[PDB]
């Protein structure tokens with residue numbers, strides 16, 4: 259399940275991926291500098307996913323898998339999208355953009371992708 263604290267820390271194609279997502283360089287750079295922290299409370303199909311970034315600014319997110327849900331995209335951008343569950347993976351899709359998240363070896367890891375580049379993430383599990 260996706261539950262407990264997590265420590266986002268090693269990433270790939272981060273700057274290109276965020277630039278394609280459409281993000282300002284100052285926050286791309288400072289976000290990388292700030293090791294991101296994350297926490298999740300899976301709840302029988304419902305979820306309350308949370309983030310802490312660019313100076314640990316907290317943000318809350320939430321959805322039910324299979325259903326469309328509103329997904330804020332930082333204080334500024336926003337979109338609606340469907341979060342999904344293909345067994346262990348927490349699959350998800352967006353207009354012209356896709357990702358899948360997954361727990362492996364009791365670690366939160368993900369395989370995000372956009373435009374024409376991957377974006378693996380790694381986030382150790384902790385409490």
Ligand SMILES: C[C@H](CCC(=O)NCCS(=O)(=O)O)[C@H]1CC[C@H]2[C@@H]3[C@H](O)C[C@@H]4C[C@H](O)CC[C@]4(C)[C@H]3C[C@H](O)[C@]12C
Pocket residue numbers: 276281282285286289294307308309311312319320329330331332341348350359
């Ligand atoms: C890519 C987004 C921002 C990550 C971040 O913190 N970046 C640093 C700031 S910026 O980029 O540099 O501006 C994050 C913020 C909230 C995220 C969403 C929410 O956490 C809710 C779910 C969580 C699921 O595990 C994956 C799908 C998802 C629907 C997430 C997709 C994506 O990872 C989002 C939209």
